[PDB]
Design an enzyme around this catalytic site. Structure first.
Site, short mmCIF file in Angstrom:
data_model
loop_
_atom_site.label_atom_id
_atom_site.label_comp_id
_atom_site.label_asym_id
_atom_site.label_seq_id
_atom_site.Cartn_x
_atom_site.Cartn_y
_atom_site.Cartn_z
N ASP A 198 -0.85 13.04 11.46
CA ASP A 198 -0.63 11.62 11.17
C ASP A 198 -1.29 11.24 9.85
O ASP A 198 -2.50 10.94 9.81
CB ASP A 198 -1.18 10.79 12.31
CG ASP A 198 -0.96 9.30 12.12
OD1 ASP A 198 -0.18 8.92 11.23
OD2 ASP A 198 -1.57 8.52 12.89
N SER A 223 7.31 2.66 -4.60
CA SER A 223 8.65 3.14 -4.90
C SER A 223 9.27 2.26 -5.98
O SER A 223 8.97 1.07 -6.09
CB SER A 223 9.50 3.09 -3.62
OG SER A 223 10.86 3.34 -3.89
#
Ligand code: WQJ
Ligand code: WQJ
Length: 330
Positions: free
Chosen positions: A35, A199
């Site tokens: 994780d 992004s």
């Protein structure tokens, strides 16, 4: 040193991935959820409330000759789905894919919430975010990656998750046979303890690319892709019959649909998520309404590049002095 381990989807939907981890002496092998959105290595154990164990493999520290109680230390964590666990702490030897750390904090669960009990395939979590998020008190502990880093050939790990298929976590090296083209690296902020990056935009299907900054986290422990409501609305508008359902808790669509791809930007590069990766199947057994793999982050407070996005790429988690992230197509 290096390590290399295969990671396997827990079910036919890729809801999560499990990777075998050796703990203790002699080794006890547990299947852990790696994780990158949390920083605790915790396991079902001989201390877990018996009614909350249903099929998981447990760590028994009394059977490990290298286990030592970390006196006074406790831990308690809650995740974004509302699930939680807590307990006490041992140090022990932990190995992943041939890479060994001695003295790793292994957090033994005394209590787990229902969603963990109900998932017999996950024996615990192995956190790979920054150690500043680790919940152990009163002395915060380091992640497996942080403890291994000095011994690694290169201070990196990589995630190569499969679509309906096994993939690989590598530690200490970049497998140049595992991706196509080049790796594009992008800046990371550690200020919230996550692998947080920006992004450069998105496209829906064959549509034109929209240049827009989208701050989010690379999180292998989250199943889906959570993005701003504007972006998600633009995606689902291209699917006849798709709608946001408050009763189901997100966008659903007719299971008869063929979904468009979704592209996200990494600098000047582009990662394409095929439409089939966005299908999470019937909302309930036998239904013709299917659950979408791209959902709004509006009620979360952060955008999340979860498994839906990450499994379309070969992803480098670069833990150099200034951390960065790398993405390649594959
Ligand atoms: N939302 C969410 C994110 N990460 C995790 C969970 C839920 C539960 O399993 C452990 C990891
Ligand atoms: N991965 C996943 C997450 N949430 C849901 C489903 C799958 C199925 O439909 C109901 C809601």
């Amino acid at each position: 040193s290096t390590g290399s381990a295969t990671t396997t989807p827990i079910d036919s939907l890729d809801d999560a991935y499990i990777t075998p981890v050796q703990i203790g002496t002699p080794a006890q092998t547990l299947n852990l959820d790696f994780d990158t959105g949390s920083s605790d290595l915790w396991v079902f154990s001989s201390e877990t409330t018996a009614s909350e164990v249903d099929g998981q493999t447990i760590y028994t520290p009394s059977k490990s000759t290298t286990a030592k109680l970390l006196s006074g230390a406790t831990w308690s964590i809650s995740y974004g789905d509302g699930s939680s666990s807590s307990g006490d702490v041992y140090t022990d030897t932990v190995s992943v894919g041939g890479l060994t750390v001695t003295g790793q904090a292994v957090e033994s669960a005394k209590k787990v919430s229902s969603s963990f009990t109900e998932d017999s395939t996950i024996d615990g979590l192995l956190g790979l975010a920054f150690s500043t998020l680790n919940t152990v008190s009163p002395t915060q502990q380091k992640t497996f990656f942080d403890n291994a880093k000095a011994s690694l050939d290169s201070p990196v790990f990589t995630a190569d998750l499969g679509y309906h298929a096994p993939g690989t976590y590598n530690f200490g090296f970049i497998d140049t046979t595992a991706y196509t083209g080049s790796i594009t690296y992008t800046a990371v902020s550690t200020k919230q303890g996550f692998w947080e990056w920006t992004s450069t935009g998105y496209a829906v299907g064959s549509g034109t690319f929209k240049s827009t900054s989208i701050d989010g986290i690379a999180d292998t422990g989250t199943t889906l892709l959570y993005l701003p409501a504007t972006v998600v609305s633009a995606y689902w508008a291209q699917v006849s019959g798709a709608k946001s359902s408050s009763s189901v808790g997100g966008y659903v669509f007719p299971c008869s649909a063929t979904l468009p791809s979704f592209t996200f930007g990494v600098g000047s590069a582009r990662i394409v998520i095929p439409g089939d990766y966005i299908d999470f199947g019937p909302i309930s057994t036998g239904s013709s309404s299917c659950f979408g793999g791209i959902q709004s982050s509006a009620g979360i407070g952060i955008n999340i590049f979860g498994d839906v996005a990450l499994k379309a790429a070969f992803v480098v988690f670069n833990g150099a002095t200034t951390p960065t992230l790398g993405f390649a197509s594959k």
